Amino acid sequence: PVTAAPPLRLASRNSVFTRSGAGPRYWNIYGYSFPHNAPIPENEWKVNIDWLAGNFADFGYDIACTDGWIEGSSRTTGNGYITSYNDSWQHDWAYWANYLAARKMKLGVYYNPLWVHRAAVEDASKTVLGRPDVKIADLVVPGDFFARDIGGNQLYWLDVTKSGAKEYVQGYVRYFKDLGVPYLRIDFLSWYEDGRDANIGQVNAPHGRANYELALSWINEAAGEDMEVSLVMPHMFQDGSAELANGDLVRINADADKGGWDRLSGMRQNWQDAWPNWANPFCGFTGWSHRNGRGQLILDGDFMRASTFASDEERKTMMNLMVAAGSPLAIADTYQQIGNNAWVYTNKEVLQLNADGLVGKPLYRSATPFSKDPGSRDTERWAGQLPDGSWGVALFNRSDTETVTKTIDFAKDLGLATGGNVRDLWEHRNLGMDSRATAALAPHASAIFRVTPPKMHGTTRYPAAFAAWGGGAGFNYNHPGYDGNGFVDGLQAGSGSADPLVTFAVQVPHRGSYAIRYRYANATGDTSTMTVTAEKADRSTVDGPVHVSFPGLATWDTWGVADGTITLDAGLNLVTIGRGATDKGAINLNWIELDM
Numbered sequence: 001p002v003t004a005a006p007p008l009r010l011a012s013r014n015s016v017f018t019r020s021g022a023g024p025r026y027w028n029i030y031g032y033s034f035p036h037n038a039p040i041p042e043n044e045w046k047v048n049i050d051w052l053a054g055n056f057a058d059f060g061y062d063i064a065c066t067d068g069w070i071e072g073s074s075r076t077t078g079n080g081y082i083t084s085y086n087d088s089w090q091h092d093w094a095y096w097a098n099y100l101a102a103r104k105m106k107l108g109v110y111y112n113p114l115w116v117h118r119a120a121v122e123d124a125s126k127t128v129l130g131r132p133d134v135k136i137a138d139l140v141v142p143g144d145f146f147a148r149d150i151g152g153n154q155l156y157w158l159d160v161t162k163s164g165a166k167e168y169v170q171g172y173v174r175y176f177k178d179l180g181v182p183y184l185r186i187d188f189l190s191w192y193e194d195g196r197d198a199n200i201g202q203v204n205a206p207h208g209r210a211n212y213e214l215a216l217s218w219i220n221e222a223a224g225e226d227m228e229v230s231l232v233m234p235h236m237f238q239d240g241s242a243e244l245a246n247g248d249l250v251r252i253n254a255d256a257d258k259g260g261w262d263r264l265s266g267m268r269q270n271w272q273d274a275w276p277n278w279a280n281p282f283c284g285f286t287g288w289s290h291r292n293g294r295g296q297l298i299l300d301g302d303f304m305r306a307s308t309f310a311s312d313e314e315r316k317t318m319m320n321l322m323v324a325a326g327s328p329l330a331i332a333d334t335y336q337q338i339g340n341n342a343w344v345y346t347n348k349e350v351l352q353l354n355a356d357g358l359v360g361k362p363l364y365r366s367a368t369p370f371s372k373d374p375g376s377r378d379t380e381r382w383a384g385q386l387p388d389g390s391w392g393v394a395l396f397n398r399s400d401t402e403t404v405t406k407t408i409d410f411a412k413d414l415g416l417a418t419g420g421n422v423r424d425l426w427e428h429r430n431l432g433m434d435s436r437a438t439a440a441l442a443p444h445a446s447a448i449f450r451v452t453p454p455k456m457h458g459t460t461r462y463p464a465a466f467a468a469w470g471g472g473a474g475f476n477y478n479h480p481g482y483d484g485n486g487f488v489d490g491l492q493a494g495s496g497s498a499d500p501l502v503t504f505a506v507q508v509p510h511r512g513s514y515a516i517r518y519r520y521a522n523a524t525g526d527t528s529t530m531t532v533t534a535e536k537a538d539r540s541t542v543d544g545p546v547h548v549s550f551p552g553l554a555t556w557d558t559w560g561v562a563d564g565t566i567t568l569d570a571g572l573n574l575v576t577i578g579r580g581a582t583d584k585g586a587i588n589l590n591w592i593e594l595d596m
Helices: 016-020 030-036 042-054 093-102 165-178 189-194 209-223 237-246 260-265 281-291 312-324 348-356
Strands: 025-028 063-065 106-110 115-117 131-135 140-145 155-158 183-186 228-231 249-251 298-300 329-331 361-364 377-385 391-396 404-409 420-424 429-434 436-441 446-452 459-463 468-470 474-476 487-491 501-508 512-521 528-535 541-550 560-568 571-578 587-595
Touching: 025 106, 042 063, 042 093, 063 183, 093 106, 131 165, 155 165, 165 183, 165 209, 189 209, 209 228, 209 237, 228 237, 237 249, 237 281, 249 281, 260 281, 260 312, 281 298, 281 312, 281 361, 281 377, 312 329, 312 348, 312 377, 312 391, 312 446, 348 446, 377 404, 391 404, 391 436, 436 446, 459 501, 487 501, 501 587, 512 541, 528 560, 541 560, 560 571, 571 587
Parallel strands: 025 063, 025 329, 063 106, 106 183, 183 228, 228 249, 249 298
Antiparallel strands: 115 155, 140 155, 361 377, 377 391, 391 446, 404 436, 420 429, 420 446, 459 587, 468 501, 474 487, 487 587, 501 571, 512 560, 512 587, 528 541, 528 571
């Protein structure tokens, strides 16, 4: 029988945003500001918003998000917080948040709350929120400008060791949250952390690892559950540990820049040990995929610039990659650039994958980090499972010249026993019951499918190799007999301060008790245990934590099925299985099955 267990120790922010699904749908001003190398004029912001409200907001793109070119945003409140996007603007953030609200839309803000504007420093009357004893001037080291070494002299980096720093940072974050902002986009993280950029050189003073960790913790706490934390230009040191602990989204690619295929798939394929580890999002999504999924990180492939691509097939590939990876769907085409390309963003069936919370993984080929061996994961074949047990499957051809066949086999690759109904979401075509999804793809073309397994008596299988991994859990394939492409290992005593775990999202019809199975290996020589919980998206406990027991078997090549009962509620549950300090032994996990 199961016994009560303490909670697992976590190493991620684990917010409602990352637990509830995929990245958000939004529009960003980058399509204006990047080619203009200029802040967006207020009238251009308005006309874009009005265009969004009449076309894309109805398809869920209901956040209008600002971006950089903010050195000219100098006006601040009495506590040093910027009052608008640019000094040329006639209206403040609240005005625009209300204008958006009237159009069923929300404001997204680009700002880094460790920036302190020189104009606020220079006004002795300005003081830290709740700390009238600390002038804004008292928060900075003389000369410690953002981008100092390439000419920056308008924004300071905050000195987090100064009295008042926490109140300033947290107040800045809450300032936007309170304005009704659901999305805060925080850039130039790596430049704060070590003052280095591998494409430029020394850019400003370093601030160090402990200060970076501290700053991120303050931001996380202040954002809470109401505002999503997007981390842009992070170094992702120590396998992204600080960002995972404190954020919802991490950029995984170099900036979209001029867009097109070279930015989507080119530049360089190799990993490097500094921002951005991978340049193109095919490689970055693939390389950071071990950190994705419910309660871990949402991977951010930056901005979609549809008009910058050479063909409609490339445009579909752009969109299909973002959706496959669970990324934010961030349109950067302006009303002038969009042309005849609105359709790219508004395929209801493709969007439905995002709404349902698809977070795909590339097909794993080995356990070796992708940063060390690009053979270890397949950038061109992606799959993820939805809470109802259906799947999104995406196939890509990154060749510039050849037509190439790509295939995902539901047994051999996904680890299912059932096959599934296959629907091509760009043809809008039912292909019927099949054992595989396949396409002969033209250069730069792709295909994306909804795959729906039939369920005997409600039996739904969730393969662990396509679920969310945390705390050191990961992919392997080094003991035969697993269903699918592999299994999850590393489920033993944690190497540090986190407990290894796997998280599954499951959807059921009513509040109550349901029958669960766990296919596992355990050749430790004794019964092993794992801690199992069920929770709502907001982390509220539905079941457990309980120790579930797993009998010892003869060899690591032997697989068994443990049986259990789990209380699941109607709709979305997160079922997490992991190895805590009070658990015994170790297991390898192949899959769970539910009878809903």
